[PDB]
Design a protein around this ligand. Structure first.
Ligand SMILES: CCCCC/C=C/C/C=C\CCCCCCCC(=O)O[C@H](COC(=O)CCCCCCCCCCCCCCC)COP(=O)([O-])OCC[N+](C)(C)C
Ligand SMILES: CCCCC/C=C/C/C=C\CCCCCCCC(=O)O[C@H](COC(=O)CCCCCCCCCCCCCCC)COP(=O)([O-])OCC[N+](C)(C)C
Ligand SMILES: CC(C)[C@@H](C)/C=C/[C@@H](C)[C@H]1CC[C@H]2C3=CC=C4C[C@@H](O)CC[C@]4(C)[C@H]3CC[C@]12C
Ligand SMILES: CC(C)[C@@H](C)/C=C/[C@@H](C)[C@H]1CC[C@H]2C3=CC=C4C[C@@H](O)CC[C@]4(C)[C@H]3CC[C@]12C
Ligand SMILES: CC(C)[C@@H](C)/C=C/[C@@H](C)[C@H]1CC[C@H]2C3=CC=C4C[C@@H](O)CC[C@]4(C)[C@H]3CC[C@]12C
Ligand SMILES: CC(C)[C@@H](C)/C=C/[C@@H](C)[C@H]1CC[C@H]2C3=CC=C4C[C@@H](O)CC[C@]4(C)[C@H]3CC[C@]12C
Ligand SMILES: Clc1ccc(CO[C@H](Cn2ccnc2)c2ccc(Cl)cc2Cl)cc1
Ligand SMILES: Clc1ccc(CO[C@H](Cn2ccnc2)c2ccc(Cl)cc2Cl)cc1
Lengths: 602, 602
């Protein structure tokens, strides 16, 4: 494992510092022994290929570092060599320790401001506690030392240099927790760039502005918006401001900023949607175009489900040919074959409803399947905000309809099976449209968070109780006449009856005309106390507890689903139905850009 | 009782101080009368055998104490004599009152720094509000007077002296509430020890470090860890530290530190498991070895319960020989005798499943019974963290299986009884394995805390309602025909029907074809309002209230169960499956010790 390897790397490194007396002196700063050793090799190297000068820089020993550089000036130019620390210089270490004096002493001796720490200890991963990129300027920026940043720029550090992820220093500053100085650092670096560095993409294709959206950095987003707004006027308490939508609206731009925010895995990303130009833009798009078109699609989908349902109610059946010789058999009707299922006027009316049913199932796969490939399947079905569980059950409904079409054509018996599943999944997928309505939308998120949370834990322990008691009830009744109490007459019936008795959906079995086993009254008293009294009421109690705790996130998730719907509809619908949002600059002399005017009170 | 005796001791002591004028003057500090009495016995003794100098020290009277010591210097050497205060000197009292001047005046006169207050007022018990051990140094330490501690050490107080419990002054400092100075006192005492006193066991076998674990003293534990860590390096925001696991991991050491913490009765002990080297160690042990092996044992136990269940579903039965002459009799099948229960191929397949069933029941007792003797039965079955209620029901299942084996061998009728109990308890004991899974584990603690809490109180008052109403319903129906409403036809049926009606698991009795008693509709209206409407919904309401209050402790108990599982698995499994945790020091030149490297951000 990685942690065991990193640990061994750290232990070997400290051992080699103990073993080699020059490295031991570089750690301890005992200038007497260090003078004797350098008076008496200087290119000696620790376990990771680091020099004695890396050791002196790591332990923050300015004097030992000057002695080492006086005896061997070339050490200031040396990288570390082994896989965790490849390319790390003493300048990366001195910058990270903020030793401005040692940074000057290294730069005065030819330490390379363009050296890149490509080793695995520096990369962005859950393995590493920090990500400062690869260059000393990116370290000084994330460490927050403006005086070291200037000093490195004055020695010719390339401010537009890129990490192995393609990240510039501006991208790396968006990723830091220290947001209180990261914005001050961002201004310092833009002052030396003076194509703008704000427009350089990383290897994901993200500019710094798009990365602040994806990562949910609302502090850096609202800082970046200060150079993308113009105050038109202020009059007493009122201000009118004009925000530039160019990056927010991302017109004709691959994945758009608003797609990148709503499809981000980072739970902070949904907070960008509350920021002034974004909130007013997505609110405008929803109220003017999104809600009207979502109410149309919701209405058309309900009429399509009424059409499919009617084709199941009027499903073609005939009187069975085979006699009911078994007294326990109740089947009286049978499927019509294709050559007899389409004869009357009503059969031709149903053929139209069935062809509409199949046409909608094809159209569902034509809408769904391409979006799997754009978003990636793991995120497409995974993300609550995009509709992930509804994309599973709508593709499953469409598949069950097209399966049933093949069964109808090949005279296959058993259409009740895929039609019963398609009727349940088809109607339950109408809850996809609940996200458009403030009344239904937050509640449909509780249904989801209770299904994959409390209902899941409950069903695991409920299943253990049902297996114990269904077995005790079955063996209690094995010796008794099945005609007098049938609920436990075989193991599959005993399981189903015990499940229905748990949820109190079937009455406890009794027959006062006969003597039931005494072991049944004992077993059912224990069952009624564990299943019905304790666990079925403890389900209500733990749902009530989950409900009050989750109620805020439920609302934040609902307002993010309305934005994700708005972004989906605008992407997928014809552009003539979605006129470009905001104010066109060109007819006011503002050039090709488009704007959002926000008027506000203070 | 103890309190009545202590009270009488205190009253007699004050009476003897009132009665004897030297003790009265030693209490009042009236130097005139005290001079006259000492000018005019001085070995006079209060009810507990204390001298006039103990009285002067108790009332903090420095002047009277100097007058008494000037007239009778030997009083500084005297103990108290009666059972509550045996061996207490005026030096113990003066140290507890922090009278540094009186402590010097006593030590200057030969007061014994090694005297031990062995009386019952000083011992560790719920009877006593303080436990300072027995020696004046242990008093001065717990009282927190560094100047009195030095003064006693300078007069030759043995710092390694032990209380009647075997506790040294270091053990006693772990037991004090005053943790804000107890650590400063701990350093002061280690400075005079300079075998280390940190390694001396008490009569429980606990070193001071193990006692901080058992007592849940997280402040003294994290203080003791400062001399059991080494900082390897710091580089900007990151530090790497190397903790010595020698006492935490307790390799080959009887009860190990981690056993002593998880099996402690003190509800604070589980907080030690959140401390940096312990949390990272038990997290490592769980993720690398504990969770894999617990998922294997959980899977093997579920397959064993499927095997046992199948042996009950395929249980050997034949058509009854005796006729159903009673019209209320429904038994049609009967046990096969041993000599006819094993004839077909399917009976020999079932004999393998039955021998697997019996083999697992023996193995359960071979695993369970020795652990009773290590932990002690009162704690083994009592502790939630160790699995106490599951150890009861798994030993009960194994006993019911071995009972059923004897019944099968001795042709005994009634195997339905122990098999129905073994099927319920056997399957419900699968919830033991819920502690390995973050989804199921905290919820299984709510099931336990609701069973022994809210379900218990509810069942006591529910039973009182059921006895009232089952009796009213039975006597209402005694005069009526049993064939028209059978639910209350005898008292045992009336109790069971009333219990099922309370929980609404059987529908209220009605028969619209006949006139029921008017007293039934009255009694059932009152029953439906008290049982179903009020109490069954008040159960849900009080469980919801318990749920939100207990939800934090439920999570702390779950994370302590994961550690207790980790500690159990490592103890009971073969050592080749559990490679020794942490980093071996020897291959890095650190000697025989083993370490945990923790890398952290600030
Ligand atoms: C999110 C939560 C997910 C939880 C999922 C768990 C679901 C468990 C529910 C039930 C599964 C079993 C369905 C019926 C199978 C037996 C039908 C049958 O064929 O029975 C028997 C044969 O087999 C058996 O003896 C059953 C053996 C016991 C199996 C119990 C289930 C095992 C797996 C359960 C899951 C384990 C983990 C649970 C959680 C820890 C057929 O005999 P008979 O009854 O026809 O006649 C009576 C007997 N003569 C023929 C002699 C007259
Ligand atoms: C955690 C909570 C724990 C709570 C535990 C409490 C459980 C109480 C539940 C019930 C226990 C009694 C079970 C049935 C016994 C009668 C069967 C029988 O034999 O009845 C009778 C004989 O006796 C009786 O008259 C019963 C007398 C009343 C006893 C009531 C229970 C007493 C103890 C209850 C607990 C006290 C404390 C409660 C809480 C404060 C048999 O007459 P018969 O009915 O056949 O015919 C009808 C009558 N001829 C024969 C004339 C036709
Ligand atoms: C025998 C068939 C009918 C069984 C297996 C069918 C299961 C269906 C009814 C279950 C499977 C998953 C369930 C499910 C998945 C996820 C969600 C999203 C949530 O925000 C609203 C409820 C909803 C929509 C529910 C509805 C009911 C579903 C669709
Ligand atoms: C309690 C939780 C775990 C939920 C999910 C499980 C419920 C179980 C008990 C239910 C779900 C579907 C049920 C079920 C499906 C279909 C049949 C076929 C029928 O001819 C006999 C009953 C039988 C065999 C029952 C057995 C009990 C089952 C398997
Ligand atoms: C007639 C028989 C079948 C009656 C008496 C049997 C009672 C059983 C079902 C009861 C007795 C004590 C109960 C019990 C004890 C303690 C715990 C630990 C808790 O964390 C989970 C539930 C669990 C596991 C429950 C399950 C149900 C048990 C085991
Ligand atoms: C309400 C709480 C206190 C729970 C624990 C108690 C329930 C009582 C009412 C239940 C538990 C088991 C039941 C019970 C066990 C078995 C039998 C034998 C049967 O031939 C007649 C009913 C009879 C006699 C009933 C009477 C009512 C009992 C004793
Ligand atoms: Cl689960 C679910 C999901 C979506 C709707 C859509 O709900 C709206 C009505 N509504 C409800 C609340 N506020 C408005 C609706 C109903 C019927 C028809 Cl035909 C069209 C529409 Cl638009 C209803 C349930
Ligand atoms: Cl009450 C109870 C206790 C333990 C399990 C063990 O649950 C796991 C599944 N699980 C559940 C949650 N997260 C994972 C499991 C199921 C079946 C089999 Cl055969 C093996 C295993 Cl490991 C299930 C109920």
């Amino acid at each position: 494992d990685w942690e065991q390897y990193r640990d061994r790397v750290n232990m070997l490194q400290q051992e080699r510092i103990r073993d080699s007396p020059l490295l031991q002196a570089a750690k301890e700063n005992d200038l007497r022994l260090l003078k004797i050793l350098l008076l008496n090799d200087f290119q000696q190297r620790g376990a990771v290929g680091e020099t004695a000068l890396h050791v002196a820089a790591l332990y923050d020993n300015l004097e030992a570092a000057t002695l080492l550089m006086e005896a061997a000036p070339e050490l200031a130019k040396e990288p570390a060599l082994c896989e965790p620390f490849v390319g790390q210089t003493a300048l990366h270490i001195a910058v990270m320790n903020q030793n401005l004096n040692l940074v000057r002493a290294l730069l005065a001796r030819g330490a390379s401001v363009s050296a890149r720490a490509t080793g695995a200890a520096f990369r962005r991963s859950p393995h590493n506690l920090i990500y400062y990129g690869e260059h000393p300027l990116s370290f000084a920026a994330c460490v927050g030392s403006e005086e070291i940043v200037r000093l490195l720029i004055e020695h010719g550090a390339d401010i537009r240099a890129q990490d192995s992820l393609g990240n510039t220093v501006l991208h790396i500053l968006i990723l830091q927790p220290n947001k209180t100085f990261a914005c001050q650092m961002y201004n310092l670096l833009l002052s030396y760039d003076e194509q703008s560095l704000e427009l350089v993409p990383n290897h994901q294709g993200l500019t710094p502005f798009k990365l602040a959206g994806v990562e949910g950095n609302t502090v850096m987003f609202q800082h970046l918006m200060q150079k993308r707004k113009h105050v038109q006027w202020t009059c007493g308490p009122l201000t009118s401001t004009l925000y530039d939508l160019t990056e927010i609206d991302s017109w004709g731009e691959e994945l758009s900023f608003l797609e990148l925010v709503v499809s981000s895995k980072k739970r902070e990303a949904r907070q960008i949607l509350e920021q002034t130009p974004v909130k007013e833009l997505v609110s405008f798009k929803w109220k003017k175009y999104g809600r009207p078109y979502f109410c149309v699609l919701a209405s058309l989908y309900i009429l399509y489900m009424i059409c499919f349902t009617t084709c199941c109610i009027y499903r073609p059946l005939k009187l069975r040919d085979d006699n009911r010789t078994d007294p326990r058999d109740i089947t009286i009707l049978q499927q019509k074959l294709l050559q007899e299922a389409y004869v009357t006027h009503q059969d031709n009316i149903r053929l139209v409803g069935e062809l509409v049913t199949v046409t909608g199932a094809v159209i569902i796969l034509l809408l769904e399947i391409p979006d799997i490939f754009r978003v990636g399947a793991s995120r497409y079905f995974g993300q609550t905000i995009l509709g992930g569980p509804f994309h599973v059950i709508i593709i499953t409904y469409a598949s069950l309809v097209l399966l049933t079409m093949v069964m109808r054509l090949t005279n296959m018996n058993g259409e009740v099976v895929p039609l019963s599943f398609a009727l349940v999944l088809g109607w339950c997928s109408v809850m996809y449209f609940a996200r458009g309505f403030q009344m239904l939308g937050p509640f449909t998120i509780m249904i989801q968070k209770m299904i994959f949370g409390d209902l899941m834990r409950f069903c695991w322990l409920m299943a253990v109780v049902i297996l114990g008691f269904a077995s005790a009830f079955h063996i209690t009744f094995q010796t008794e006449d099945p005609n007098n109490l049938g609920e436990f007459s075989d193991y599959p019936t005993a399981l189903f009856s015990t499940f229905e008795l748990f949820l109190t959906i079937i009455d406890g079995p009794a027959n006062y005309s006969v003597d039931l086993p005494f072991m049944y009254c004992i077993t059912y008293a224990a069952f009624a106390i564990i299943a019905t009294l304790l666990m079925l009421n403890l389900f209500i109690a733990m749902m009530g507890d989950t409900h009050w705790r989750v109620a805020q996130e439920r609302d934040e998730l609902w307002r993010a689903q309305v934005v994700a719907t708005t972004v989906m509809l605008e992407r997928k619908m014809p552009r003539f139905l979605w006129p470009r949002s905001g104010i066109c600059g060109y007819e006011y002399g503002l050039g090709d850009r488009w704007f959002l005017r926000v008027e506000n009170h203070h």
